[PDB]
RNA sequence: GAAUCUCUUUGCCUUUUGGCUUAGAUCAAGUGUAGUAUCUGUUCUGUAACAACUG
């Protein structure tokens, strides 16, 4: 039960990837470490995780080489800066600009 | 020596590039229907002789 801090949606299980949180009562709330490992897990409104502490990944390898040792890398993908002024964060593709003057010629695929 | 025809190099070029400026400048991603162009395929393969008249 271990947890990486992903700086978008803040924390993700090394098993399966469920967007955990931490819980305002802990002692590590404020506070932000990378690696984490939780005691318990609780499912309601949102995930909390409780009794959390920092861990360094050295130790997660060194006492656990047979749980485990890319391609999370090759399915990746990235989106820009978010701006107020465009209304819809995808007009900016040639995909859209082709749509936006095939819809004002009034053709249709 | 000289004429006629015909072929090689050698001359001739004989349908043998007729202005300028900011290369004068920009840009070639639309649907249907229609016109024009072209391009692939298949099969099959009466005449002569004799007898008579010259009108």
Do not use: C
């Not at 039960?1 to 299980?13: E, I, L």
């Not at 984490?36 to 060194?62: A, C, D, G, K, N």
């Amino acid at each position: 039960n271990a947890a990486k801090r992903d700086s978008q949606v803040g924390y993700k299980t090394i098993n399966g990837g469920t967007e955990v949180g931490i819980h305002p009562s802990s002692s590590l709330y404020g506070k932000e470490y990378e690696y984490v490992m939780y005691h318990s897990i609780v499912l309601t409104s949102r995930e909390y995780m409780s009794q959390v502490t920092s861990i360094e990944p050295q130790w997660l390898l060194e006492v656990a080489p047979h749980f485990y040792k890319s391609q999370s890398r090759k399915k990746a993908k990235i989106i820009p800066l978010h701006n107020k002024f465009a209304k819809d964060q995808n007009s900016w593709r040639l995909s859209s600009i082709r749509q936006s003057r095939e819809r004002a010629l009034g053709i249709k695929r």
